[PDB]
């Protein structure tokens, strides 16, 4: 030779089954000072020229692997005690990168893969049989590292198909593999991170069903928190660090109602959809909370935080959110919380809140089935005004007075029998053009009310004021119409005494009010006074008019002759005359009557 | 026939309007008219009833005859009923309405009404006095020894002096005053006392003291010439002597004519009430019936 030619023959021809130490002479010889049979050696070496010990040793390992597949480490003696640099790091790397993982796989799975087939194996099926911590430490990493196959493995194995996160154990493997891929990567890094974000993005729902969620979310935030400013996955979905922080903060502090995927979709929905999703979240959570305050406080940390903008509900203002919430709390009859919220975000005298409160006052009002202070709907109507009172005086102006008053007469009215059909407070509004019709019904059904002008009178004027019914000095007239009704029902109840006092007081009010009122009293009301003058008590002893009553009746009729329609002067006079004659026929001195 | 009816109703209305048209300050001011003083509304009112005939003329009579009287009476009645509520002093009104039918004696309804109204107020005055007097007398009957004079001294007498009599003076009709005094003395006091079951010595003295206070309150000197007024007080005064006299003085009084004003039955009744039966009461009673008999 050529030493090439000396080594080549020694590589093929020396019996594959000899102990490797019998070849140690070949290395030391490096560490310091039929002729067509060559066709066969190069047949075996495949025309490979065999230039030095290291070249020799890969070739000899392979040629003996042929016959002793069960022992890939056969030639470990020859490379272990090698003196300075007779073997390049290339050789040792192969040992660490191929032979050792190969052996370990073989001797784990009771297999005997040959080094050559092991190397030429599609990496896809290579990883695939690696998968059915020791395994990752001294099979997977050494392999990935040697072939520089990190990005490859990550892409084909570290993805959403392999990591459904449906099971605790899968999750736990997701984290193990993450950690050691992270370790062995320092541009395949962005693929690892892109895939962590991809895995979480599609399988958050499976993850949220796992155990120790809260702990798992912390574990994940541990990792995520190190990722770059921006990450891209899948379609062309891009998430920033600030978004990821708030998303995760949302899941950890506030709610797992929405998956990661759903959260992202809310990010890109229209204002309208977002608001809807927002109130849904509030209503659902308010209804699960031990205490609404705990969920409010969590929202103050995240999605209702005035200190920073919301990267989840991106298209709706603090105001719209708070409004939505007040509407939810009103329907929930959570008046205390409504107050707290109004105070916190300083909504005092806010027009929009005013109108919401008022709208709900009427809702409760119209829903009430009676006016008593205890009726649940009246209670809520009341609680709604106390809020208007505490936090909306300015904007309410005179309107609070009215509403407070309308509630009051509602309570009073429900203490009496009404049969205008029970009687809903909402029916009161229906009588706005005929308030007296309500008073008439009361006087009829409540047989002692005619004696209580003071209260029937505050009802009537309460109804005028509460419903903002006009009273153009027509309140003199109104009082009168009210009083004639009382006379009507006093007679109905056989109480001439009360009838007469009222009748006398009415004539006076009208005398002062002047001639206008006196004609009106007459043209409208003469029949009441005629009837009083004609009144007969069935219970009268002997069916005889008591003398004192005769006299009173005569006087009412005579007062009536001043103001009654001229058509009625005959019959009024006739009665007067009838009473005068009976009177002239009694012994006033020893009077069997009065 | 139904045309006439419509016109009569329309002028009937014109009259009621005319009454309503009388200014309010006419029922309160007084004018002198011949001297009597009437309320000012009186002259306006008079026109209403004249104008009523005037309005009858505008369809005559004959066309009005069948209803004339009713509608006339009705209008007087309406007027009376109305003005009754307008005139404060029941006594001015009596004079006011009296002036009306003196000037126009066609208003028969008005005089019937006015006088029946007069009777009512007299009866009210009588009723007040009847009760006071019956009360005082009951008080006396039941508390001989130490009777309470309060009814008479604080209620009856002041009532008469300060209320009833000055009220009745206003009517300018001394006949009415005389009727009241006659009623009080005979139908009230004397009749009441005559019906006691018996009249004790102490009660007789009490009753006499009562009569003297009573006379004090029935003194209306202006009536001193009227015979029924003078005789009413005389009988009371003589009853006062009888009530406190011994049997002998009663016979002497009889003899001197002092019981001129007493029917014989009434004299015997007083004696039976005031004295226990004895030979003396008998002879005295039989003597009085006898001398009166011979007369």
From Swiss-Prot, chain A:
<dbReference type="GO" id="GO:0070939">
    <property type="term" value="C:Dsl1/NZR complex"/>
</dbReference>
<dbReference type="GO" id="GO:0006890">
    <property type="term" value="P:retrograde vesicle-mediated transport, Golgi to endoplasmic reticulum"/>
</dbReference>
<dbReference type="GO" id="GO:0015031">
    <property type="term" value="P:protein transport"/>
</dbReference>
<dbReference type="GO" id="GO:0005789">
    <property type="term" value="C:endoplasmic reticulum membrane"/>
</dbReference>
<comment type="subunit">
    <text>Component of a peripheral membrane protein complex consisting of DSL1, SEC39/DSL3 and TIP20. Bound to a SNARE complex consisting of UFE1, USE1, SEC20 and SEC22 or YKT6 through direct interaction of TIP20 with SEC20. Interacts with TIP20 and DSL1.</text>
</comment>
<dbReference type="InterPro" id="IPR013244">
    <property type="entry name" value="Sec39_domain"/>
</dbReference>
<comment type="function">
    <text>Required for protein transport between the Golgi and the endoplasmic reticulum. May contribute to tethering of coatomer-coated retrograde transport vesicles to the ER membrane through interaction with and stabilization of the SNARE complex.</text>
</comment>
<keyword id="KW-0472">Membrane</keyword>
<comment type="similarity">
    <text>Belongs to the SEC39 family.</text>
</comment>
<keyword id="KW-0931">ER-Golgi transport</keyword>
<dbReference type="GO" id="GO:0005783">
    <property type="term" value="C:endoplasmic reticulum"/>
</dbReference>
<keyword id="KW-0256">Endoplasmic reticulum</keyword>
<dbReference type="Pfam" id="PF08314">
    <property type="entry name" value="Sec39"/>
</dbReference>
<dbReference type="GO" id="GO:0005635">
    <property type="term" value="C:nuclear envelope"/>
</dbReference>
<keyword id="KW-0813">Transport</keyword>
<protein>
    <recommendedName>
        <fullName>Protein transport protein SEC39</fullName>
    </recommendedName>
</protein>
<keyword id="KW-0653">Protein transport</keyword>
<dbReference type="GO" id="GO:0032581">
    <property type="term" value="P:ER-dependent peroxisome organization"/>
</dbReference>
<dbReference type="GO" id="GO:0016192">
    <property type="term" value="P:vesicle-mediated transport"/>
</dbReference>
């Amino acid at each position: 030779g050529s030493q090439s030619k000396y080594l080549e023959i020694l590589c093929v021809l020396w019996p594959e089954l000899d102990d490797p130490k019998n070849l140690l002479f070949l290395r030391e010889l490096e560490e310091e000072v039929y002729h067509e049979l060559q066709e066969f050696i190069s047949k075996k070496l495949n025309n490979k020229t065999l230039e030095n010990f290291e070249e020799w040793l890969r070739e000899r390992i392979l040629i003996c692997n042929e016959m002793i597949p069960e022992t890939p480490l056969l030639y470990s003696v020859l490379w272990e005690t090698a003196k300075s640099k007779v073997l390049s790091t290339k050789f040792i790397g192969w040992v660490e990168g191929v032979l050792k993982p190969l052996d370990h796989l073989n001797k784990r799975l009771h297999l005997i893969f040959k080094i050559n087939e092991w190397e030429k194996m599609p990496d896809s099926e290579l990883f695939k049989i690696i998968f059915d911590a020791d395994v990752i430490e001294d099979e997977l990493a050494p392999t990935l590292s040697y072939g520089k196959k990190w990005e490859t493995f990550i892409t084909e194995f570290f993805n959403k198909q392999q990591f459904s996160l449906k099971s605790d154990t899968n999750y736990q493997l997701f984290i193990k593999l993450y950690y050691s891929l992270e370790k062995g990567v320092k541009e395949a890094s962005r693929k690892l991170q892109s895939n962590v974000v991809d895995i979480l993005f599609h399988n958050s729902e499976n993850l949220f069903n796992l155990s120790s969620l809260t702990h798992k979310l912390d574990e994940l935030w541990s990792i995520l928190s190190g990722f770059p400013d921006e990450i891209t996955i899948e379609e062309q979905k891009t998430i920033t660090a600030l978004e990821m922080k708030q998303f995760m903060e949302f899941f950890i502090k506030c709610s797992t109602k929405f998956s990661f995927k759903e959260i992202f979709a809310i990010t890109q929905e229209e204002e309208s959809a977002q608001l809807a999703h927002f109130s849904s979240l509030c209503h659902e959570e308010f209804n699960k909370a031990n205490e609404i305050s705990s969920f409010l406080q969590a929202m103050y940390e995240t999605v209702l935080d005035i200190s920073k903008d919301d990267k989840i509900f991106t298209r709706i203002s603090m105001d719209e959110k708070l409004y939505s919430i007040l509407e939810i709390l009103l329907q929930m009859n959570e008046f205390a919380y409504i107050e707290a919220i109004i105070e916190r975000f300083d909504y005092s005298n806010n027009t929009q809140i005013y109108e919401l409160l008022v709208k709900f006052f009427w809702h409760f009002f119209n829903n009430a089935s009676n006016g008593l202070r205890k009726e649940p709907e009246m209670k809520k109507a009341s609680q709604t005004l106390q809020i208007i009172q505490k936090h909306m005086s300015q904007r309410a102006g005179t309107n609070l007075t009215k509403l407070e008053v309308l509630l009051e007469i509602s309570d009073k009215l429900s203490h009496y029998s009404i049969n205008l059909n029970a009687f809903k407070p909402s029916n009161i509004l229906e009588y706005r053009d005929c308030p007296l019709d309500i008073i008439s019904n009361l006087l009829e059904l409540n047989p002692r009310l005619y004696k209580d002008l003071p209260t029937t009178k505050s009802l009537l004027f309460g109804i005028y004021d509460s419903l903002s019914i006009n009273r153009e000095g027509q309140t003199g007239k109104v009082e009168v119409d009210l009083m004639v009704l009382h006379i009507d029902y006093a007679l109905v109840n056989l109480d001439f005494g009360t009838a007469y006092e009222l009748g006398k007081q009415v004539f006076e009010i009208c005398q002062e009010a002047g001639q206008h009122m006196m004609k009106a009293l007459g043209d409208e009301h003469w029949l009441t006074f005629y009837q009083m003058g004609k009144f007969v008590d069935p219970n009268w002893v002997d069916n005889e008019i008591p003398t004192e009553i005769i006299v009173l009746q005569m006087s009412i009729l005579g007062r009536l002759l001043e103001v009654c329609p001229l058509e009625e002067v005959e019959i009024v006079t006739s009665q007067w005359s009838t009473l005068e004659l009976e009177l002239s026929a009694r012994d006033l001195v020893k009077d069997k009557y009065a | 026939n139904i045309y006439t009816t419509l016109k009569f109703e329309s002028m009937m209305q014109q009259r009621v309007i005319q009454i309503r048209s009388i200014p309010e300050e006419e029922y309160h001011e007084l004018v002198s008219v011949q001297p009597i003083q009437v309320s000012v509304f009186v002259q306006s009112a008079a026109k209403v009833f004249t104008e009523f005939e005037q309005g009858c003329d505008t369809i005559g009579r004959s066309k009005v005859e069948s209803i004339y009287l009713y509608k006339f009476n009705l209008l007087q009645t309406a007027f009376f009923a109305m003005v009754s509520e307008k005139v404060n002093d029941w006594t001015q009104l009596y004079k006011d309405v009296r002036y009306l039918y003196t000037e126009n004696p066609k208003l028969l309804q008005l005089m019937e009404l006015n006088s029946r109204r007069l009777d009512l107020n007299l009866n009210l005055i009588k009723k007040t006095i009847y009760k006071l007097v019956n009360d005082q007398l009951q008080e006396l009957k039941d508390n001989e020894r130490t009777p309470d004079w309060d009814i008479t001294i604080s209620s009856l007498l002041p009532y008469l002096k300060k209320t009833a009599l000055p009220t009745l003076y206003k009517l300018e009709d001394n006949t009415i005053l005389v009727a009241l005094i006659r009623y009080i003395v005979h139908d009230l006091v004397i009749d009441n006392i005559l019906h006691w079951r018996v009249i004790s010595e102490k009660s007789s003295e009490n009753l006499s003291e009562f009569i003297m206070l009573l006379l004090s309150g029935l003194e209306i000197p202006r009536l001193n010439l009227i015979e029924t007024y003078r005789h009413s007080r005389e009988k009371l005064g003589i009853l006062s002597k009888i009530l406190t006299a011994h049997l002998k003085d009663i016979l002497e009084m009889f003899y001197e004519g002092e019981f001129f004003l007493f029917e014989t039955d009434e004299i015997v009744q007083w004696i039976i009430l005031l004295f226990a039966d004895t030979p003396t009461r008998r002879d005295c009673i039989d003597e009085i019936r006898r001398v009166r008999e011979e007369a």
